[PDB]
């Protein structure tokens, strides 16, 4: 309590000596309250838009571009039996990650690049690269780094802002990311490493995953997601996590120490509130991170929830309230004999997770689960999970996956969603300050993002045509997963050597000649998932498509552009 969060909150209070204001009327019942102080959207992208019009009077597109009680909530704690489960799991899952990697301290020069090459690091000097060209600064993180190195933390403070972001300021992100960083930095989670793990893989890889899972003996496959997994996170989970310090050694170990109990372990966040003064609280649970050091933790305590929901439904324990000897023996020898052949039947990222158990008594082992406080979204606590019998319906990753057979014989597995999904978020830009080069370019990414992963569907082919038909051949795709759609190279080569060239599912590297031998989903499949062909407005669309580049054209101005309509077989002369 308050001898570790004190200083940071006696700095905060001294800072607003002319405000400070002990409100006894706060709405915190789960948050720690500790006082308070006086303080005080998404835009469309005219370039897609205009190039996509049918979608103009579709709501699931427009409504998508206008615009709680889950974070201040306790999970209870879990039983003798649970907390032992979770805590040799942890211990057995840290050894196997770390068998074929070196836990390091990550850099400046790492972070410093980071910043230049534009990552959203979550940060509140104008901009953060001014920060890391200031010796100012990285003295700050000096002390600071000291303060860690004694135990003591000053100004690693959150700001809060089924989505809450925790910004920090950049060097309490660069103290985070220099204890924490090698779990992305260096590919923990990758499927090499850590066998249900997918951090790197990429869209064109995802669906092939699946199917390799799916090739298992078992039984259905399972992919219940969480409700609110952050809010779920607990105490005993975040202690799990920080065994990993357990690798480490020397100055490294201690600086990921204190990460995990002084910023983790022991949180403390700003929140505004309306009625406006700045809210300074408090607590000891939950998840509270960098986005991608949360994306790497999560995925451990999703791989270890799930492994012991395995272990629950093949009977190697009875009981959560107590674990017997006997029964720890059992799991020890479970994990060590299968715990490898259970990792490869998972597919989990973050929170999301794919499941291919040996059989379908994991749809009703739920003890452990619940008792965790994993609790499943849009079912009853204790109603038997709905499995999936066909790998082609399972969803992971906000997608589902088709078999996509080559006029050749060669075969696609692709990335797919609600067509609708994909088009309202490419009418959205976030931030404004936009110039009309930058919105061309962001335009330009999604239709690049279109021709690689969602070729597969007749309206984003056409679209993505129309977009860089539109904007000028030479400029380059921006952005504020594997992404090779960031290029200005030909996107017939990229589409060759993403799908042909580095796919380890494709024996015959014969490359493809043209965008005529890449087939597309049947027309009906491409209805289902939201196709609007058959709709006069779509065929009108594709008809006078030229008309609506050359709108685009002329608002841009006088440039270099490449027609490539053509690449289309009706569009030919
Ligand atoms: C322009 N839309 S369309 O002419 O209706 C159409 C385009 C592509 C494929 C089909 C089956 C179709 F009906
Ligand atoms: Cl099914
Ligand atoms: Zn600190
Ligand atoms: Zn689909």
Known sequence: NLDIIGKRIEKIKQEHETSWHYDQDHPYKTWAYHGSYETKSSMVNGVVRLLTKPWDIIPMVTQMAMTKEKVDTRTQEPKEGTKKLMKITAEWLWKELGKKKTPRMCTREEFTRKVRSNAALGAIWKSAREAVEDSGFWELVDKERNLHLEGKCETCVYNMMSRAIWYMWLGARFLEFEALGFLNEDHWF????????????????????????????????YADDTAGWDTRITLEDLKNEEMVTNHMEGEHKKLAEAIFKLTYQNKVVRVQRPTTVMDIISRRDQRGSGQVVTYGLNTFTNMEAQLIRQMEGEGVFK????????????????????????????????????????????????????????????????????????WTQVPFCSHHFHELIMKDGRVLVVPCRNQDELIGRARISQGAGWSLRETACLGKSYAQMWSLMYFHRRDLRLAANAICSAVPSHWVPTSRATHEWMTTEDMLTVWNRVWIQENPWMEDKTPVESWEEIPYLGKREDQWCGSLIGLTSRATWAKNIQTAINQVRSLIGNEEYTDYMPSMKRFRR
């Open 319 to 390: 009981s959560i309230q107590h674990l017997t000897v006997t029964e720890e023996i059992a799991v020890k020898n479970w994990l060590v004999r299968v715990g490898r052949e259970r990792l490869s039947r998972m597919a989990i990222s973050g929170d999301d997770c794919v499941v291919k158990p040996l059989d379908d008594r994991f749809a009703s082992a739920l003890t452990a689960l619940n008792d965790m406080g994993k609790v499943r979204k849009d079912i009853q606590q204790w109603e038997p999970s709905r499995g999936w019998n066909d």
């Open 190 to 221: 990758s499927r090499e490493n850590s066998l249900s793990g997918v951090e790197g893989e990429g869209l064109h890889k995802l669906g092939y995953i699946l199917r390799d899972v799916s090739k298992k003996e078992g039984g259905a496959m």
